[PDB]
RNA sequence: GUGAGCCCGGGUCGAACGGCCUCUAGUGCAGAUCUUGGUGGUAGUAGCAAAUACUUCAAUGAGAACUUGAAGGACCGAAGUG
């Protein structure tokens, strides 16, 4: 029912991620955490994420990670030729208010 | 053949060698913490932990943590990592 195509917001809540975290390692197991759940969320092995979401995840150093942040995952077509996945998924850093209070909204299309 | 050994078959191989009587010796190895060379178990084991720290995209390429460009985050902190 779903299309092959699709974008999707979500919450990502990187403080339950990354509870007890080792300080020099916080922002990397961030990174890992936002490929995991767009994996998760998508079915994509094949995540891309976004320059200005990792500037985004190292805005405060390397273990001042935001508590919450907000995601557009878009799940797009591999168009090259040989390629091992059919499908992959970009993810973005969403320019909002305020990430809390926030449900998962489909982004239309046009 | 008591024995040290001797002989034959099969396989491999490629240019010399053996029996008998005498002559001759640098003539017979398990040891010498030997000598030289080669090879095991240990064992895919002990570790590969000082010098704060790495991350994203793109390109190159058979292959990219430790190549390059950009984007970030840090360190040396002028008795410097200049």
Do not use: C
């Amino acid at each position: 029912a779903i299309a092959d195509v699709v974008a999707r917001e979500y919450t990502i809540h990187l403080h339950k991620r990354l509870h007890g975290v080792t300080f020099k390692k916080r922002a990397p197991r961030a990174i890992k955490e936002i490929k995991k759940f767009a994996q998760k969320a998508m079915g994509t092995s094949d995540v891309r994420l976004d320059p200005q979401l990792n500037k985004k995840v190292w805005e405060q150093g390397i273990k001042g990670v935001p508590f919450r942040i907000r995601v557009r995952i878009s799940r797009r077509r591999n168009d090259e030729e040989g390629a091992k996945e059919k499908l992959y998924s970009y993810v973005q850093a969403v320019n909002v208010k305020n990430p809390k209070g926030l449900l998962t909204s489909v982004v239309e299309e046009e």
